[PDB]
Amino acid sequence: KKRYLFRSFKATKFFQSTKLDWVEVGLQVCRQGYNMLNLLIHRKNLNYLHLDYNFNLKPVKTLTTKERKKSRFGNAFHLCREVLRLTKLVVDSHVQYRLGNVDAFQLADGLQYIFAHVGQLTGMYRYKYKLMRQIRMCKDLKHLIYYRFNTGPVGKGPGCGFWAAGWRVWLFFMRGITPLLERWLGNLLARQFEGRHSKGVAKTVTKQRVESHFDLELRAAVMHDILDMMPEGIKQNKARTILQHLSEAWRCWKANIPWKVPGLPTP
Amino acid sequence: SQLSKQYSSRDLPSHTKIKYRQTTQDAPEEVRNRDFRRELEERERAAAREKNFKVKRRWDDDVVFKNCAKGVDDQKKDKRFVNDTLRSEFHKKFMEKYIK
Amino acid sequence: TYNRQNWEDADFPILCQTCLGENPYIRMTKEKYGKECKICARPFTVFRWCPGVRMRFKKTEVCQTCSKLKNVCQTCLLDLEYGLPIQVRDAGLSFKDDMPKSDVNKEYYTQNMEREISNSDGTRPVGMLGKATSTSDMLLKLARTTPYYKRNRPHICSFWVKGECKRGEECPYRHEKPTDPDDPLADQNIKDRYYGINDPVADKLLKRASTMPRLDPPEDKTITTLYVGGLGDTITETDLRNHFYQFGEIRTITVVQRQQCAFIQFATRQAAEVAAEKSFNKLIVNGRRLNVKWG
Amino acid sequence: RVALEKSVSQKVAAAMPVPAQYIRYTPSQKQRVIRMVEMQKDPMEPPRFKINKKIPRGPPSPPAPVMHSPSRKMTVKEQQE
RNA sequence: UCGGCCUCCGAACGGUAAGAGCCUAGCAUGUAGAACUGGUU
RNA sequence: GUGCUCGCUUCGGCAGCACAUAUACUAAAAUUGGAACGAUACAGAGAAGAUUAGCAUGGCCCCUGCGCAAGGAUGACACGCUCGUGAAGCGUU
Ligand SMILES: O=P(O)(O)O[C@H]1[C@@H](OP(=O)(O)O)[C@@H](OP(=O)(O)O)[C@@H](OP(=O)(O)O)[C@@H](OP(=O)(O)O)[C@H]1OP(=O)(O)O
Ligand SMILES: [Mg+2]
Ligand SMILES: [Mg+2]
Ligand SMILES: [Mg+2]
Ligand SMILES: [Mg+2]
Ligand SMILES: [Mg+2]
Ligand SMILES: [Mg+2]
Ligand SMILES: [Zn+2]
Ligand SMILES: [Zn+2]
Ligand SMILES: [Zn+2]
């Protein structure tokens, strides 16, 4: 099914439409992202942290261990912060073109340098390492372009800006990374507003939780086999004593010690 | 609880179509008319059918012991199964392999 | 670890006649899980509407389970049958019901009553309505009959109180002086109004109802002969005999049009007391209203 | 199957990551006409309320009467057995 | 008069306890409600 | 408001017809109650000598985390149940 998202947004009363110059739109997106990352920080009451403008998270003062434990952020927040940093770089390059500080050749060269050195200008890779593959592809593309560019009288200067291939690579990455970041930030907002479920969904039995859990299950099985073996009457079940006897019998099996309780019922 | 907006990563939709049994994959309309009894006897019968000067000595004459490897024959003794994990044949082979 | 209050999502809100307005055609808005309940703090289906022309856009405040529990309006927090505060109705009928105040106990009790109602027919204000069969003791005397629309009046403009309402006549809020802040009638906790504890409107109406002796009588020195005025020649001794036949045996029933008084006396003291209490400015026979006094 | 498919569709539509009616009101205290209009849900809008409020578990269904065979009282020799 | 083959690449937790409550921040709500005096032995 | 009248008839307007028919959590506020956990102070790190790795288990205890992962001091918190005295019922004297 198609399910166009923007038509569903435009059908409501909370969305409007206009026509706009692209540089103003990029400035609006960067300002909106910075403003709401500050709103998330102030929602979590982390007034001792500070976002930059270029999306650099830094503490104001030295942190206590409670502030260090509470101020830790996951991969979703840091990945969105790095993505907004990359768009801030691209939009600021177009802004400095539009003020006339740099030339259009310099703007194309800056776009090529950004799309070839995402891994050197951003800390993007630390929160999702698979992008190294994309980074590797960008590096390979640069080599291809450079060794079709620096061919005749042109040399090893920085004047080559042919930014279409890296732009293609990062938009195909953005296509793939849109629903994952949408689900992650939706889960982050739902935990921020609905609160964290304490027990909630049951924990799986992972590797570090195998052995003790097996003992727990073993204990439960023995308890069931106590409660239907004992006949009618007998108020003193004494199942804890039977579990202690089972633990002692297993410990005597481990040490090759002959285990024999002198008076003990046969079943 | 269906009021939450937290979506688990393993709660995404996957394997949305149920595979059904085909005609050769024992659909119940061909199970219901069959007689499993007789087919079980020719399968059991097929399994039972397919189940079946100076003179010297000899050079090795001057030793102390002879025919010491006489009754050494494993054969079917490796086919024995014991439900004791310290007296199993696999555990004995394990202990003679991994301890020198 | 798997117990929580369920969210109450239902249509058809339970409102008074006064808060609903006067127009037969009302345009109505519904949010599925818009706000929380003002008492039991659960999310609930929030209904909002304008009751009339210059009203306030009143909306529902408490959830449907609390309003079905106490048989009150979802906005006015007054009784559906009589338009009274629930403290006055609890003083009239029964005050031993109560409710917990701590939030965990309140949520647990509300979940238990919600499960009881959902296991019931669906629309019944528990056994308290079974304790509400006895009525018209004194609550019908001070109950309103006309729809009091002045509580749907819009709020007071706070900019006009400081004299800075730049909208002027465009401002939908009221450009009039507020009530006295020193008056103890202006406190009005919502939880106090729901729980029926120290509400000043309820205390003022209880003091007003206590000063109206509509069932006192007993102005004779052990004499059952009481005079009901206002009868005249319109009400005869047959209506007095039919009124006294419900009390049992009547010693004497007569009507005099010279003083316009009906003399009623019973052989029993309790029957004469019931006949004097029923005819003390609450009995109308043959188009004539009777007020019982000494004769 | 129809009821369970309705329940499955309701559960999936509750778990899926994202007309005006006319009714007649009888107040029983004449009749009114009410135009049921649902307000538009803002898609740009987080959940409103904390839902992690744990309360202790409520009372169960009222208990069933307990049929049994009459109880065989154990002897004292059975008690030290 | 006879060959080309070129992996890697970094971040978090894992250490600088925990509890406590007094004034303090930030943040939620923009609320429901104001009923008042009259009859003859 | 716009457009037109077998109009009234001035040339301005009136009258009629046709179209156009119900916004707003209505605030630029007054209010109201909840609080990060930082300063000081109280405070003081599991396992019978000491220094310590940990996995659990229960739920009106939570925090970080996208978590059916992993951390938070092992996250914290989570011990004392074989004889006489009387009473009731049953059978014998
Ligand atoms: O990493 P950079 O500093 O940005 O240098 C890269 C590139 O480096 P990589 O191959 O590691 O991707 C080469 O530089 P070298 O590795 O050879 O030192 C290349 O140089 P050549 O193609 O000449 O071999 C070119 O440098 P240049 O502009 O001089 O051609 C280019 O530099 P830029 O990306 O800055 O353009
Ligand atoms: Mg120790
Ligand atoms: Mg560990
Ligand atoms: Mg742990
Ligand atoms: Mg540790
Ligand atoms: Mg340790
Ligand atoms: Mg633990
Ligand atoms: Zn009402
Ligand atoms: Zn409620
Ligand atoms: Zn005003």
DSSP per residue over C256-281, as a string?
ETTTTEEEEEESSHHHHHHHHHHTEE
* Residue located via tokens 């804890």: A240
For chains B and D, count residue pairs whose Cβ atoms are closer than 8 Å. 11
Nearest by CB to residue D33, choosing from C16, C25, C43, is: C25
The nucleotide lying nearest A45 (C-alpha to C1') is F36
- Cα C77 from Cα C88, distance rounded (Å): 12
* Amino acid at site A244: Q
8 Å CB contact between C51 and C152: yes
8 Å CB contact between C189 and C83: no
- Cα C65 from Cα C35, distance rounded (Å): 15
Residue range(s) defining the domain that contains residue C245:
225-294
Residues in a beta bridge with C262: C228, C255
Q: Which residues contact C279 (CB under 8 A, 6 or more apart)?
A: C226, C228, C243, C262, C264, C290, C291, C292
- Cα C290 from Cα C244, distance rounded (Å): 14
Integer distance in angstroms from CA C55 to C1' F53?
A: 71
φ, ψ of residue A246 in degrees (nearest 5): -65, -40
- Cα C254 from Cα C243, distance rounded (Å): 12
User: Looking at the complex, does the CB of residue A147 fall below 8 Å from at least one CB of chain D?
Assistant: no
Burial of A167 (0-12, 13-18, 19+ CB in 10 A): middle
CATH number for the domain that contains residue C231: 3.30.70.330
List the single best residue of A44, A193, A229, A238 to mutate versus D (max D Cβ within 10 A): A193
Residue of D nearest to B16 (CA): D12
Burial of A202 (0-12, 13-18, 19+ CB in 10 A): exposed
Across B84-96, b (16+ Cβ under 10 Å) vs e yields: eeeeeeeeeeeee
Atom 7 (ligand 1) nearest CA: A143
Q: Which helix (H) or strand (E) holds C151?
A: none
**The token pair that represents A233 in the structure block:** 């009457």
A181 CB contact with strand F at below 7 Å: no
Strand E bases near protein CB (under 7 Å) are 8-13, 15-19, 26-27, 30-41
Q: What is the DSSP letter of B12?
A: S
Query: End-to-end CA distance of chain B, in Å?
Result: 59
* Amino acid at site A164: A
For chains C and D, count residue pairs whose Cβ atoms are closer than 8 Å. 73
Neighbours of C245 (CB within 10 A): 11
Helix (H, G, I), strand (E, B) or coil at C68: helix
Strand F bases near protein CB (under 7 Å) are 22-30, 36-39, 54-72, 82
Q: What is the DSSP letter of B8?
A: -
- Cα A167 from Cα A171, distance rounded (Å): 6
Distances (CA, A) of C234 to C226, C228, C277: 19, 13, 21
Q: What is the DSSP letter of A124?
A: G
Integer distance in angstroms from CA A242 to C1' F88?
A: 37
Resolution in A: 3.1
φ, ψ of residue A35 in degrees (nearest 5): -65, -40
Q: Which helix (H) or strand (E) holds C27?
A: strand C25-36
List the single best residue of B5, B10, B12 to mutate versus D (max D Cβ within 10 A): B5
- Cα A35 from Cα C65, distance rounded (Å): 41
- Cα C25 from Cα D74, distance rounded (Å): 78
Integer distance in angstroms from CA A204 to C1' F54?
A: 19
Sign of the alpha-carbon dihedral angle for B24, B27, B30, B34: positive
Q: Which helix (H) or strand (E) holds C204?
A: helix C200-210
Across A226-243, b (16+ Cβ under 10 Å) vs e yields: eeeeeeeeeeeeeeeebe
* Residue located via tokens 């965990």: C104
8 Å CB contact between A78 and A125: no
Atom 1 (ligand 1) nearest CA: A117
Helix (H, G, I), strand (E, B) or coil at B65: coil
- Cα C190 from Cα C195, distance rounded (Å): 9
Q: How was this structure determined?
A: cryo-EM
Neighbours of A115 (CB within 10 A): 23
Give me the count of residues in chain D: 81
Query: End-to-end CA distance of chain D, in Å?
Result: 55
Distances (CA, A) of C32 to A133, C47, C48, C65: 46, 9, 12, 15
Which ligand sits nearest to residue C162's alpha carbon?
10
Residue-wise DSSP of C228-255: EES-TTTS-HHHHHHHHTSSS-EEEEEE
- Cα C279 from Cα C290, distance rounded (Å): 6
- Cα A228 from Cα B79, distance rounded (Å): 39
C193 CB contact with strand E at below 7 Å: yes
Comparing C-alpha atoms, which of C271, C282, C278, C293 is closest to residue C218?
C293
**Partner-chain contact A197 B4, CB within 8 Å:** yes
Sign of the alpha-carbon dihedral angle for D3, D8, D14, D16: negative
**Partner-chain contact A191 B6, CB within 8 Å:** yes
- Cα C21 from Cα B57, distance rounded (Å): 134
Sign of the alpha-carbon dihedral angle for C179, C185, C191, C193: negative
